[PDB]
Amino acid sequence: IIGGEFTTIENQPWFAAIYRRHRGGSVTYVCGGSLISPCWVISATHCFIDYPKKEDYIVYLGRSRLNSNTQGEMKFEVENLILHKDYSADTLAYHNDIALLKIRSKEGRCAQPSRTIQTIALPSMYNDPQFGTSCEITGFGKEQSTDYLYPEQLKMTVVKLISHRECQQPHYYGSEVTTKMLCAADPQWKTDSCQGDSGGPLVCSLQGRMTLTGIVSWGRGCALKDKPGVYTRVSHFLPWIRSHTKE
């Protein structure tokens, strides 16, 4: 996250931190995600497409720090890893960049709400807030585009939803932003998602409720004028989501 502020898991208790175990026994951070029900975390397909094997991944909830333990955290295995079958990666952008992880503890339990863990509501199908609405993004992504290390403490910031009208302008992203995506940025362009934030939530208030409206996908640079963050438009994937989740 560029700009914004350090925060703790209690302010973003749906945030899921996803790691991959290495054949060495090294474990490194992969991506963010969001807890949409006790057994289900949603993220981006591109985080896993390269290594698509559920066994290699661990999911933490209740975790405020990247490489050290938070009290109240809970560790989970991936029971199944559901990528999107129409996922595609272009020269610039990702398409249908959405994924599901079913989580279970070694004990066999799903997530349990807590000071530090809570589910986040899905929006109603095709129901998204209006452009200019302020939303929150969270993650362990780079604090600057040029950095080589990731921050150890979770961060969040506030961005504003952009119209497709405006996001399609050629000096923005042109034809490369489709209606299954959502743009969001700071009007002054000083805060943004960045590398390492992918899979994480864009959260807005939609008719009273804190709702999962986007999933961090791609953007050009970070906090670069005229180049906003692009997110998977979650309202457009409920059928996909319910098919795989109602099980």
Partner: peptide, 10 residues
């Protein structure tokens, strides 16, 4: 990797 990916491994 897409040129605009935010994925840490790219």
């Amino acid at each position: 990797c897409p040129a605009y990916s935010a994925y840490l491994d790219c």
